[PDB]
Design a protein that fits this description.
Chains A, B, C, D: Belongs to the thioredoxin family. Four copies of one chain form a homotetramer. Chain A is an alpha/beta fold and 105 residues long. Chain A has helices at residues 10-13, 30-46, 61-66, 93-99, and strands spanning 3-5, 20-25, 51-56, 74-79, 82-88. The structure holds cacodylate ion (2 copies) and zinc ion (5 copies).
């Protein structure tokens, strides 16, 4: 249920009418795998409030560099086309709920 | 030229006239000292469009908690009484300028 | 099941052959609260392989700066008095098992 | 003089004679470009004591995943056949000196 973003379609994605939660991940990132199902389900339950997207850092160096990613996983919540929150590391469902409580209001 | 905020006066502060760029810092912070001058100059050059302030996370957990802060430093531009943009880590002069050019007009 | 470390007793605590996992946490860190119980069960179940400890970054800026902490929760595994692993962010029970696979033998 | 390590020749390098310092990097890494000359010079000044190598995480997902890499860059010093110390993020030459020189004899 997650939208797949690329260096090419990134800007378009975040200029949308719904906040966008972007998962910066990689295949080599063990925690990212474990997190995928949790994020997918999170996406399914709140598609009415936020769009959850994923960006493969291995294939999109431009966007990853632009937002200064330092560690993988890293999720950035975009509102109005700007980064307003940056979640570092594994995010359990309870934290996604708590951190995006505002956009989910 | 850098207002000090606390849990007690924080709410009032972000409800002021000008947008407020809040630097959440900690004594253990790595690039904060290296950032102090950058923020001073930034404040000096944008006195009319923004108020630069600092919040020591070591002594103000409530606000730090509320805004889901995890990285130090974290800069959050408040406009409309809510975060409109957030930057983490060391932000040099030009990057600060490029990143904020769009939320200060 | 979890010893408390400070700037004053930190060096002594890591000066041994038995691995020590140090959770660098803060009062303002929501995730950290959610993880305390996961860390506690882990400590109890692997006391024979690793010593689990906590260091409150708000009160211990020396050690925290020494190891270059940038975000909170950060757990550092020490072996032979040197940091051999830095786990960034929330660590679910399974990630702790995976990540510390080596020491758990 | 730094070696380029791959999933193919990785074990062969870290398993032998002298210590091996591996720089896990990525094209999107912020401080990696800046760190390149620093790693090269530190390597030369301690060539008898350590072999310095680079591993692109994108191109070599297996080794990256095996060592639980999360932050880019991550430096891991291998002794015998295992990690004896890890550093994350940008490191100027004097920090590589302060952090690794003593552990290299
Ligand atoms: C061996 As030297 C020049 O780093 O003291
Ligand atoms: C500073 As040295 C251990 O390379 O003589
Ligand atoms: Zn939900
Ligand atoms: Zn300007
Ligand atoms: Zn176990
Ligand atoms: Zn030296
Ligand atoms: Zn010397």
């Amino acid at each position: 249920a997650t939208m797949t973003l690329t260096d090419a379609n990134f800007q378009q994605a975040i200029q949308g009418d719904k906040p966008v939660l972007v998962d910066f991940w990689a295949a080599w990132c063990g925690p990212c795998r474990m997190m995928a199902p949790v994020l997918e389900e999170f996406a399914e339950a709140h598609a009415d409030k936020v769009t959850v997207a994923k960006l493969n850092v291995d294939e999109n160096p431009e966007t990853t560099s632009q937002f200064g990613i330092m560690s993988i996983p890293t999720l950035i919540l975009f509102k109005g086309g700007e980064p307003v929150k940056q979640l570092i590391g594994y995010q359990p469902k309870e934290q996604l709920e708590a951190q995006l409580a505002d956009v989910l209001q």
